[PDB]
Amino acid sequence: KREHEREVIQKAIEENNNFIKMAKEKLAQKMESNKENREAHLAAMLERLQEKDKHAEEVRKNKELKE
Amino acid sequence: REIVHIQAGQCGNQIGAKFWEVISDEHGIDPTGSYHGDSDLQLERINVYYNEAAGNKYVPRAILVDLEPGTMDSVRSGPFGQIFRPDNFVFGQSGAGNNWAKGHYTEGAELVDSVLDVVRKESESCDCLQGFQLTHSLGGGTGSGMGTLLISKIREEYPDRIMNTFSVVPSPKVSDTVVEPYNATLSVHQLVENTDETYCIDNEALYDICFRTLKLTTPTYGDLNHLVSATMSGVTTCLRFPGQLNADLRKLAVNMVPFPRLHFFMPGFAPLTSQYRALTVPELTQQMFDAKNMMAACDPRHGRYLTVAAVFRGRMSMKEVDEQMLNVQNKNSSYFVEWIPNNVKTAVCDIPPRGLKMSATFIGNSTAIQELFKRISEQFTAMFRRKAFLHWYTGEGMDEMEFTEAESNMNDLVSEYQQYQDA
Numbered sequence: 396k397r398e399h400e401r402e403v404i405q406k407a408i409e410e411n412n413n414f415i416k417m418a419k420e421k422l423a424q425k426m427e428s429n430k431e432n433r434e435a436h437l438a439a440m441l442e443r444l445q446e447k448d449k450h451a452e453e454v455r456k457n458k459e460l461k462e
Numbered sequence: 463r464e465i466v467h468i469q470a471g472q473c474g475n476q477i478g479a480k481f482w483e484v485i486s487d488e489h490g491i492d493p494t495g496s497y498h499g500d501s502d503l504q505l506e507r508i509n510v511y512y513n514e515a516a517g518n519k520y521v522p523r524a525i526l527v528d529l530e531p532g533t534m535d536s537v538r539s540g541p542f543g544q545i546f547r548p549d550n551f552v553f554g555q556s557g558a559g560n561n562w563a564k565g566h567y568t569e570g571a572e573l574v575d576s577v578l579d580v581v582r583k584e585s586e587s588c589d590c591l592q593g594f595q596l597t598h599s600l601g602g603g604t605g606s607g608m609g610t611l612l613i614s615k616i617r618e619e620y621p622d623r624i625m626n627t628f629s630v631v632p633s634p635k636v637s638d639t640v641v642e643p644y645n646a647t648l649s650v651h652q653l654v655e656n657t658d659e660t661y662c663i664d665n666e667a668l669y670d671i672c673f674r675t676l677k678l679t680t681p682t683y684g685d686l687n688h689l690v691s692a693t694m695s696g697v698t699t700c701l702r703f704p705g706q707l708n709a710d711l712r713k714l715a716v717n718m719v720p721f722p723r724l725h726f727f728m729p730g731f732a733p734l735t736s737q738y739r740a741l742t743v744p745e746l747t748q749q750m751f752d753a754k755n756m757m758a759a760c761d762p763r764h765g766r767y768l769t770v771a772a773v774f775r776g777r778m779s780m781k782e783v784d785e786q787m788l789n790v791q792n793k794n795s796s797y798f799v800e801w802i803p804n805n806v807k808t809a810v811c812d813i814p815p816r817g818l819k820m821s822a823t824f825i826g827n828s829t830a831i832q833e834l835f836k837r838i839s840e841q842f843t844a845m846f847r848r849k850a851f852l853h854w855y856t857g858e859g860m861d862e863m864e865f866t867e868a869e870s871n872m873n874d875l876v877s878e879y880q881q882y883q884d885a
């Protein structure tokens with residue numbers, strides 16, 4: 396019985412630690428994945444905008460090399 | 463000689479305190495621990511329950527245990543609260559949340575060692591310890607879970623001593639939580655293995671007595687405990703005063719327990735009170751055997767008596783007592799098993815309890831006690847078949863298997879009581 400008593404309380408400790416661990420790792424995975432997604436969204440927007448600045452240069456050249 | 467008393471949890475400590483109030487008054491011990499009685503019969507076996515300290519002070523051999531302080535602060539402020547040894551108060555802070563697993567495996571385990579230190583110090587100075595009595599409920603967490611843990615640890619360290627409980631069985635009629643049947647089934651499993659004698663004090667019966675018989679429309683814990691304390695005074699009379707019959711815990715066990723697992727007793731008391739009319743010996747005798755006077759809600763006509771102890775208190779004719787005890791046995795012979803001859807024993811003590819000229823206490827080992835276990839078993843199953851409320855227990859590390867095993871063992875106890883009833 397004493398050995399069963401010790402296994403019950405270790406099982407409880409083990410499950411609580413495991414809950415804390417899994418919640419800590421899930422949160423860290425979500426926050427990473429969210430950071431990367433947001434940054435990829437912003438980087439695509441900037442990249443469309445840089446392509447506009449590039450195209451505006453081709454316009455001023457077309458006009459220069461027209462004359 | 464010496465008995466060590468332990469009271470655990472809210473219920474255990476409330477009924478425990480009343481027990482000490484009632485017996486300290488019977489022995490002439492006041493709240494300071496001074497003897498101011500009128501009769502040498504009061505002091506002759508005083509050492510069974512009280513240590514003697516310097517100044518002719520009598521101190522209960524009593525240990526007070528809980529996982530929360532509240533009820534023990536209330537004990538200390540109660541009328542006799544100063545009589546207890548201060549070092550014998552052993553309390554945690556956490557509570558057990560009506561959760562047997564907290565009492566037995568997590569919170570209780572943390573505290574149990576400090577309780578055993580006090581048990582050992584009381585035991586060490588006993589001339590010849592006979593054993594232990596524990597007061598507790600089975601429906602909560604501390605008395606039920608931690609109480610049965612204590613019993614198991616006490617047995618491991620005093621394996622040749624007698625273990626006796628006053629165990630309060632839960633009822634929906636006087637109920638605190640839905641999980642009581644779980645806590646009681648888990649506890650009964652422990653009691654079946656690790657006590658020698660258990661007085662089944664059923665809250666169902668106490669309630670029905672207060673309501674039906676005493677006409678109390680709304681019974682409180684105080685009204686239930688008035689019955690418990692009169693019963694406890696009655697069933698320990700033979701331990702506490704000079705006498706022939708059942709004078710120590712082992713001799714009572716030997717007279718009462720024909721098979722080791724069947725050690726669950728149905729107590730009774732007469733007259734029932736919460737009044738001036740003299741009660742005759744015939745009337746005490748009929749009323750003490752009446753279903754309505756039993757503290758376990760079991761119909762004794764639905765089973766048979768394996769053994770009975772009857773204790774009469776007060777000045778009365780011993781001839782008349784013998785005749786009436788013989789009369790109930792002779793007219794109701796079919797309710798007493800024929801294969802244990804002369805299975806009813808009678809004691810008479812001259813000192814009556816407070817406020818009565820005459821009283822009788824009944825202790826029955828009846829196969830009808832199976833009704834109590836079946837009632838608990840049905841309430842257990844109704845929940846357990848849907849695993850309802852189990853997460854309270856599995857969160858403390860317990861598996862379902864432990865619930866299945868406890869239920870199976872209590873169903874076996876029921877089948878055994880049924881076997882001897884049909885024999």
Ligand SMILES: Nc1nc2c(ncn2[C@@H]2O[C@H](COP(=O)(O)OP(=O)(O)O)[C@@H](O)[C@H]2O)c(=O)[nH]1
Nearest residue numbers: 471472473476599601602603604605632636683
């Ligand atoms: N007869 C009686 N029953 C009680 C008392 N207090 C609680 N109970 C019962 O005891 C059970 C609850 O356990 P309790 O002792 O409060 O919990 P614990 O402190 O964790 O042991 C329920 O079945 C209640 O009906 C009391 O003073 N007298």
Ligand SMILES: [Ca+2]
Nearest residue numbers: 556568569572
């Ligand atoms: Ca702790």
Ligand SMILES: [Mg+2]
Nearest residue numbers: 472473602638
């Ligand atoms: Mg309570």
